[PDB]
Amino acid sequence: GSVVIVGRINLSGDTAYAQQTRGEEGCQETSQTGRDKNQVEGEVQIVSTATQTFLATSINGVLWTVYHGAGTRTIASPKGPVTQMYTNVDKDLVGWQAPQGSRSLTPCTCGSSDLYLVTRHADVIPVRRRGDSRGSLLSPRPISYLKGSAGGPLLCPAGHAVGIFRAAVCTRGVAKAVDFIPVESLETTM
Numbered sequence: 683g684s685v686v687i688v689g690r691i692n693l694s695g696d697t698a699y700a701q702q703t704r705g706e707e708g709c710q711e712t713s714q715t716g717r718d719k720n721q722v723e724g725e726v727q728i729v730s731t732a733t734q735t736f737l738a739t740s741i742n743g744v745l746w747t748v749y750h751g752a753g754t755r756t757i758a759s760p761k762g763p764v765t766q767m768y769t770n771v772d773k774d775l776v777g778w779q780a781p782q783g784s785r786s787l788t789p790c791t792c793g794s795s796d797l798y799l800v801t802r803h804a805d806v807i808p809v810r811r812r813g814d815s816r817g818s819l820l821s822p823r824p825i826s827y828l829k830g831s832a833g834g835p836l837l838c839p840a841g842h843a844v845g846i847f848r849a850a851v852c853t854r855g856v857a858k859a860v861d862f863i864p865v866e867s868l869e870t871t872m
């Protein structure tokens with residue numbers, strides 16, 4: 683089936699919170715047909731397949747997510763399934779054209795290393811950048827807390843996109859750091 687948008691992380695106000703826009707039955711139906719007529723809003727979408735759920739983030743007019751979540755699948759849209767515009771298994775990255783109604787993040791040009799990871803539960807987690815594709819959690823969390831947030835963004839203090847969350851760096855079940863696709867690699871892929 684297609685990947686289906688089932689909610690979003692609302693970042694528009696003073697408070698970050700998840701919203702569900704489609705339940706599991708409707709999601710299952712929409713995945714089979716590839717036809718999704720629901721209104722899309724925001725920069726960070728919660729998405730699902732038949733078997734998994736994760737995030738997808740709009741940057742530069744593309745809705746980006748991880749290959750390990752989406753594989754080569756289409757995404758459901760008001761006019762039927764939409765094929766990926768980008769697929770890179772080596773970077774664990776896919777992208778589709780961004781849905782009408784979505785808002786896109788701007789790629790960061792700040793050169794700053796104080797970042798913020800947004801999870802599928804609308805937790806905003808500070809992250810110190812530690813390399814091109816790594817950042818440390820200021821406060822370590824069990825894996826559980828981050829599971830299902832691949833595809834979500836790392837943002838700079840100004841709200842620009844710095845990367846897409848890919849993997850957790852763990853020791854005995856605790857995530858001390860994160861691995862992400864840097865926005866420059868998105869821009870190159872482009």
Ligand SMILES: CCc1nc2ccc(OC)cc2nc1O[C@@H]1C[C@@H](C(=O)N[C@]2(C(=O)NS(=O)(=O)C3CC3)C[C@H]2CC)N(C(=O)[C@@H](NC(=O)OC(C)(C)C)C(C)(C)C)C1
Nearest residue numbers: 734735736750751771774828829830831832848849850851
């Ligand atoms: C580089 C990662 C990767 N690349 C892939 C490329 C292609 C591919 O093709 C099949 C598979 C890949 N798998 C991948 O990793 C897989 C997928 C990915 C994962 O689960 N991603 C998350 C997460 O939340 N995932 S998620 O729950 O949302 C899942 C629904 C998407 C964000 C994590 C939250 C806990 N993985 C790790 O994070 C592992 N850690 C990892 O390998 O650490 C390294 C890279 C530092 C060694 C865990 C599970 C031990 C924590 C293993």
Ligand SMILES: [Zn+2]
Nearest residue numbers: 790792838842
């Ligand atoms: Zn920035």
